[PDB]
Structures are given as C-alpha cells and as structure tokens.
C-alpha cells in the first residue's frame, strides 16, 4: 500500500476448516519471514472466520517482513496445498471496482 506493488502482504485463498495464523506462519516460514506482532511477537496474518457458526472461511492473507521473499513465495506457493487443500497465493492484489469495463478494454 502507499506506492508499492511489491507488499510483502500476500494472498492466501483454499484453505478449509484450517485458516489459522499459526497453521500459515507454521508452514510459510521456510520461505521466508512472517509479518512477526508487536503484541504476540508472532507472525500476522488476516483470516476470514464465521460467527454464526464458529467456523472458518477458507481464505486469508499473510504478512510478511521481506517484500522480495512475498514474491519469492508467491513463484512457490501460488497454487499448493494446505494440509490436503489447494490454495493460491498472490503479491496482494488490490480489491475495487472498474476492472475490464469502462474506458478502455476494447480489441477488435
């Protein structure tokens, strides 16, 4: 964010029943370097869980201390497997509107 396309912030989508911040920081600390916490002194990482039920999601995103090694692990990962599941992780795409629709886009 701010002027950066290399975030070490990542995106971590096919989890299942297992999106935990340890489970992450446990199995994508080989790579690199978690976004470690002031607070808990551990990695940090945005899981979605449900309330209604008290389940997860299946999708979160992990920080991480070393913009290159996110890269580094996106060229890995980008298509693995958490513990049986496949995910898919990304440099931390943006998330808005306007996207292949508008202005341009044409090509015929």
Same mark, same amino acid.
């Given at each position: 964010?701010?002027?950066?396309?290399?975030?070490?912030?990542? +995106?971590?989508?096919?989890?299942?029943?297992?999106? /935990?911040?340890?489970?992450?920081?446990?199995?994508?600390?080989?790579?690199?370097?978690?976004?470690?916490?002031?607070? /808990?002194?551990?990695?940090?990482?945005?899981?979605?869980?449900?309330?209604? /039920?008290?389940?997860?999601?299946?999708?979160?995103?992990?920080?991480?201390?070393?913009?290159?090694?996110?890269?580094?692990?996106?060229?890995?990962?980008?298509?693995?497997?958490?513990?049986?599941?496949?995910?898919?992780?990304?440099?931390? /795409?943006?998330?808005?509107? +306007?996207?292949?629709?508008? $202005?341009?886009?044409?090509? $015929?």
């Amino acid at each position: 964010e701010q002027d950066n396309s290399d975030n070490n912030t990542i +995106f971590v989508q096919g989890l299942g029943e297992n999106v /935990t911040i340890e489970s992450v920081a446990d199995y994508f600390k080989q790579i690199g370097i978690i976004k470690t916490n002031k607070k /808990t002194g551990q990695p940090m990482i945005n899981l979605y869980t449900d309330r209604e /039920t008290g389940k997860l999601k299946g999708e979160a995103t992990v920080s991480f201390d070393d913009p290159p090694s996110a890269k580094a692990a996106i060229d890995w990962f980008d298509g693995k497997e958490f513990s049986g599941n496949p995910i898919k992780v990304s440099f931390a /795409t943006r998330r808005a509107d +306007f996207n292949r629709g508008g $202005g341009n886009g044409r090509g $015929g």
